[PDB]
């Protein structure tokens, strides 16, 4: 579900929950990315098109989520637990702006940092810094 781009579930599933924006924020960023490249100067990327795998499929997903709650009837537990999209929409957006190289090496760094015991590791996890000057 990631592999064709070089990572696995592990590498994304280390990052803490608050490392990611909200689903709606990430849909804003993505909908603005497909607006400026695969829109006019087509030649898109694998990450451009996979972004629509998340955008569209999510639409079809909160599609189900919203017609629930019209059935509080009993157990209405909806899954806004899919942040699999929060990560996903991040993984293609960052790898689009920072490059696939930078994102893969960043989440390798973070994986190392998180399974280093909280003795021999730096105080704060490595930060994925934006494109330099």
């Amino acid at each position, epitope marked *: 579900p990631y592999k064709e781009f070089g990572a696995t579930v592990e590498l994304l599933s280390f*990052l*803490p*929950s*608050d*490392f*990611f*924006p*909200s*689903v*709606r*924020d*990430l849909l*804003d*960023t993505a909908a603005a990315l497909y607006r400026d490249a695969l829109e006019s100067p087509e030649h898109a990327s694998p990450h451009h098109t996979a972004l629509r795998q998340a955008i569209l499929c999510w639409g079809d997903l909160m599609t189900l989520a919203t017609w629930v709650g019209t059935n509080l009837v009993v157990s209405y537990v909806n899954t*806004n637990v899919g942040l699999k999209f*929060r990560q996903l929409l*991040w993984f293609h*957006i*960052s790898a689009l702006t*920072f490059g696939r190289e930078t994102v893969l090496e960043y989440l390798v760094s*973070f994986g190392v940092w998180i399974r280093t015991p909280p003795a021999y590791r730096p105080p*704060n*996890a*490595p*930060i*994925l*810094s*934006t494109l330099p000057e």
Partner: single-chain antibody, 229 residues
Framework: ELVLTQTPSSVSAAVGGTVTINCQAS??????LGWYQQKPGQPPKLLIY???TLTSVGPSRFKGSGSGTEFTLTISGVQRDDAATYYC??????????FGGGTEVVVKGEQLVESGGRLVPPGGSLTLTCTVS????????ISWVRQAPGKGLEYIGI?????IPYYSRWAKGRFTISKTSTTVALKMSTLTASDTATYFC?????????????????WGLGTLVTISS
């Protein structure tokens, strides 16, 4: 797009009396509101977040209420301490986020260093550095807020741990947020005299769903950008 209209514009109350504050939104923003106290010349302070939940120091005489559109702050009985200008900062997305106009209560009876603020000509550029300490820039957000002299608070932007910036619709295409290992820098283009103000950065804390733009604490001291020819 979200505008938060805050009434009554000013309250003059007395000791032991009650002060009541109102915030009406442009959309249902759910519980994504926060209530902030700014005393004069200081930086703002976080009092309530999530429409209800009270923060660390806030005394139980302070209480918020409401969700969706109608939001209401109430100081049950008011001391000299509580006299300040009070804001509601709501966030629809981390893009559409705004403070109310401010309402000044008149009563009768881990750290961040901003830098770079200076005197810049119109149409020039500028770069602010928010030097963040004691905070994990991979787990926490750094937001940029500004206030003109004697004016209200205006949300500029935010940057998450995932290094994805977000800007307000008024700002977009001028202000860009960047991040290094130890700092969060705000680049400002074609500066017009409308922007002479005090720029603060504050750490946003994300909820379970990753909205950091309504909960800003701690706060920097701010820095003054003066635009004159």
């Amino acid at each position: 797009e979200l505008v938060l209209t805050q009434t009554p514009s000013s309250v003059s109350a007395a000791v032991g009396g009650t002060v009541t504050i109102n915030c009406q939104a442009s959309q249902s923003i759910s519980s994504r509101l926060g209530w902030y106290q700014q005393k004069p010349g200081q930086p703002p302070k976080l009092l309530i977040y999530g429409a209800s939940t009270l923060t660390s120091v806030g005394p139980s005489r302070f209480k918020g209420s409401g969700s969706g559109t109608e939001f209401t702050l109430t100081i049950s009985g008011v001391q000299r301490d509580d006299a300040a200008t009070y804001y509601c900062l709501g966030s629809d997305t981390s893009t559409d986020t705004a403070f109310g106009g401010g309402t000044e209560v008149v009563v009768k009876g881990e750290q961040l260093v901003e830098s770079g603020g200076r005197l810049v000509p119109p149409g020039g550029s500028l770069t602010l550095t928010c030097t963040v300490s004691g905070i994990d820039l991979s787990s926490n957000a750094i937001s940029w807020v500004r206030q003109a002299p004697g004016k209200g608070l205006e949300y500029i932007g935010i940057i998450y741990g995932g290094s994805i910036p977000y800007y307000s619709r008024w700002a977009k295409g001028r202000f860009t947020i960047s991040k290094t290992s130890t700092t969060v820098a705000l680049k400002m283009s074609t500066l017009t005299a409308s922007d002479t103000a005090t720029y603060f950065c504050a750490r946003g804390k994300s909820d379970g769903d990753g909205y950091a733009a309504y909960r800003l604490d701690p706060w920097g001291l701010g820095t003054l950008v003066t635009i004159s020819s």
